[PDB]
């Protein structure tokens, strides 16, 4: 299929006043690894981090469109876009091409810097939203990621515990997936600081 041509997997997980968003590093052409250092995460602002999964050209085109839209929003509206508004904007952009769909599947995590509420979203290729309170995941290893997150996640996690759970789930899901792997990159977003980490993985 077209969605599994480039490989890649992204997963967001919700802490208490924090969220951890993690992506694999592999970029390939349906069996062959073009590169092993291609993360799929994008930072919109200090509060929102989103990742794209699917056809890599569609990932890049949609990321460019989203960057254009967010810069225009910040220019017109003198403020940073919020997570819910950003997710709604992505939903509208994806539904505009309802019959010419983009082959991406975004995974958005956001936190209110003043409140601390965590908002997660994961739409389909046509924008059908999904907002749970535990975790979202997309990619070729989506089933394994879902299983690991269901088996490991608990409500009241600390940023460190949440990061460890996310890293373990991501690595174990990529081990069973031939189109994902080669380490991981994770972003822990709290109310006060944002941390970026690179996680050892198999070179397989």
């Amino acid at each position: 299929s077209i969605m599994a041509y480039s490989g890649g997997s992204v997963m967001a997980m919700a802490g208490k006043e924090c969220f951890v968003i993690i992506s694999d590093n592999r970029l390939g052409e349906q069996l062959k690894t073009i590169s092993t250092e291609v993360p799929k995460l994008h930072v919109v602002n200090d509060s929102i981090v989103y990742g794209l999964t699917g056809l890599r050209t569609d990932q890049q085109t949609f990321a460019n469109k989203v960057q254009f839209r967010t810069e225009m929003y910040k220019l017109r509206e003198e403020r940073d876009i919020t997570g819910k508004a950003f997710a709604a904007m992505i939903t509208s952009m994806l539904y505009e091409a309802r019959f010419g769909p983009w082959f991406v599947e975004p995974v958005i995590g956001s936190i209110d810097k003043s409140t601390g509420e965590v908002y997660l979203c994961a739409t389909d290729l046509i924008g059908a939203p999904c907002e749970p309170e535990d975790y979202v995941c997309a990619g070729t290893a989506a089933e394994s990621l879902h299983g690991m997150c269901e088996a490991l996640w608990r409500p009241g996690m600390s940023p460190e515990e949440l990061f460890e759970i996310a890293a373990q789930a991501m690595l174990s899901a990529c081990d069973r997936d031939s189109l994902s792997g080669y380490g991981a990159v994770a972003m822990i977003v709290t109310k006060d600081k944002v941390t970026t980490r690179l996680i050892k993985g198999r070179k397989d």
Binding site: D46, E164, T196, R197, K200
Partner: peptide
């Protein structure tokens, strides 16, 4: 439980806001 540090880290970058 998975104690913090069970997953090896290659680089780390912290950005205060």
């Amino acid at each position: 439980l998975l104690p913090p540090g069970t997953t090896p880290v290659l680089k780390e970058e912290i950005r205060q806001l």
